[PDB]
Design a protein around this motif. Sequence first.
Motif, mmCIF file in Angstrom:
data_model
loop_
_atom_site.group_PDB
_atom_site.id
_atom_site.type_symbol
_atom_site.label_atom_id
_atom_site.label_comp_id
_atom_site.label_asym_id
_atom_site.label_seq_id
_atom_site.Cartn_x
_atom_site.Cartn_y
_atom_site.Cartn_z
ATOM 1 N N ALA A 6 3.169 -78.155 57.125
ATOM 2 C CA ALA A 6 1.949 -78.115 57.452
ATOM 3 C C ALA A 6 1.127 -77.921 56.010
ATOM 4 O O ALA A 6 0.053 -78.685 56.059
ATOM 5 C CB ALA A 6 1.620 -76.968 58.325
ATOM 6 N N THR A 7 1.618 -77.034 55.158
ATOM 7 C CA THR A 7 1.038 -76.687 54.131
ATOM 8 C C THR A 7 0.788 -77.830 53.187
ATOM 9 O O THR A 7 -0.225 -78.751 53.274
ATOM 10 C CB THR A 7 1.880 -75.385 53.326
ATOM 11 O OG1 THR A 7 1.571 -74.383 54.408
ATOM 12 C CG2 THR A 7 1.371 -75.126 52.100
ATOM 13 N N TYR A 8 1.767 -77.804 52.091
ATOM 14 C CA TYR A 8 1.756 -79.092 51.130
ATOM 15 C C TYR A 8 1.552 -80.272 51.879
ATOM 16 O O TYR A 8 0.748 -81.238 51.279
ATOM 17 C CB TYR A 8 3.135 -78.992 50.638
ATOM 18 C CG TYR A 8 5.683 -78.798 53.555
ATOM 19 N N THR A 9 1.774 -80.271 53.068
ATOM 20 C CA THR A 9 1.577 -81.645 53.891
ATOM 21 C C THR A 9 0.166 -81.817 54.337
ATOM 22 O O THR A 9 -0.687 -80.917 53.948
ATOM 23 C CB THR A 9 2.660 -81.556 54.984
ATOM 24 O OG1 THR A 9 2.498 -80.264 55.638
ATOM 25 C CG2 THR A 9 4.041 -81.906 54.647
#
Length: 11
Positions: A6-9
Amino acid sequence: CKFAXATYTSC
């Protein structure tokens, strides 16, 4: 739904 995570994505 994007690479995975979720983050980096996005999703």
